[PDB]
């Protein structure tokens, strides 16, 4: 298996771990803050997914410092993981185009 495909699969597994850990740590950080809505794990996981994908509907958002720091990690992990997937697709296309050119 080539590196870029192994790295993509590794990034996908790492992203799932960030989503699960991010959902657990957000609830742990948001409870205790009056008005916080990111205080139950099922919707916290939904919030983490729409954060890593950078969709950000606005139905859920962190208000505490550590809840927002968790959000930052989720954002970077999601942007990086999907970016590595795009990078792997580019390598696949470039490698196929080299063979298409004989070189």
């Amino acid at each position: 298996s080539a590196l870029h495909w192994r790295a993509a699969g590794a990034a996908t597994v790492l992203l799932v771990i960030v989503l699960l850990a991010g959902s657990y740590l957000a609830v742990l950080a948001e409870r205790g803050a009056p008005g916080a809505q990111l205080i139950t794990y099922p919707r916290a996981l939904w919030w983490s997914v729409e954060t890593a994908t950078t969709v950000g509907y606005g139905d859920l958002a962190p208000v505490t410092l550590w809840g927002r720091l968790v959000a930052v990690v989720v954002m970077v992990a999601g942007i990086t993981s999907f970016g590595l997937v795009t990078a792997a697709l580019a390598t696949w296309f470039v490698g196929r185009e080299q063979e298409r050119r004989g070189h």
Epitope: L28, G35, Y41
Partner: antibody, heavy 118, light 108 residues
């Protein structure tokens, strides 16, 4: 089997302190929160605080006077609420409840009738 | 914090009649309301979770409705075992808050 086990009663002198217990059994997950609810005779339910035993962080109701300290012991699966400087206004029934991190209190304890008297 | 008003405090119903309990929230909480039953000298018992979801072991006559700020707990054909206090509790915003409570009494 009963999931949350609390003592029957505790007699506390005015100003003295007491520590209540709540032995947990059944399924226990890392997403468990133990809550404490206060109910005076002739009153509704009053949320006191919460604690996650898999991490040890405790939150408290900021509307009321803070007279509690929530601890947890994972080796014996027992949460503790330490009440300090008790007056007659603190005499109530104190329940413990287990929340699976999804909002509601699925199971309650029998409650410990705390009577502050001389 | 979120305020949960339950009015009226006492509901008088003759046997075998439907009875509805009211729980109004100071602000919208979607469907994050939960109902509990407490008989005399008893511990609270979960009846309905998330406004309208059933609980295993709870009789079929118990149901719930509503979303937003107004929530209803309905009991089809009230019986003597249903004589207790009924509380609502919200889980949308921290901290969790309870309602003042509504007592059910039967006119036999």
């Amino acid at each position: 089997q009963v999931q949350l086990q609390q003592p029957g009663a505790e007699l506390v002198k005015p100003g003295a302190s007491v520590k209540l217990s709540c032995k947990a059994s059944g399924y226990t997950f890392t997403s468990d929160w133990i809550h404490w609810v206060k109910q005076r005779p002739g009153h509704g339910l009053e949320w006191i605080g919460e604690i996650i035993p898999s991490y040890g962080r405790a939150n408290y109701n900021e509307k009321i006077q803070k007279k509690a300290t929530l601890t947890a012991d994972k080796s014996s699966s027992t949460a503790f609420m330490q009440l300090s400087s008790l007056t007659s206004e603190d005499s109530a029934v104190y329940y413990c409840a287990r929340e699976r991190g999804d909002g509601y209190f699925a199971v309650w304890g029998a409650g410990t009738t705390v009577t502050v008297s001389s | 914090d979120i305020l949960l008003t339950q009015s009226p405090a006492i509901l008088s119903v003759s046997p075998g009649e439907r009875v509805s309990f009211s729980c109004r929230a100071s602000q919208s909480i979607g469907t994050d309301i939960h109902w509990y039953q407490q008989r005399t000298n008893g511990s609270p018992r979960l009846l309905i979770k998330y406004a309208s979801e059933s609980i295993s072991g709870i009789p079929s006559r118990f149901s719930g409705s509503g979303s937003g700020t107004d929530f209803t707990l309905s009991i089809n054909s009230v019986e003597s075992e249903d004589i207790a206090n009924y509380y609502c509790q919200q889980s949308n915003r921290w901290p969790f808050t309870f309602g003042s409570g509504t007592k059910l009494e039967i006119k036999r």
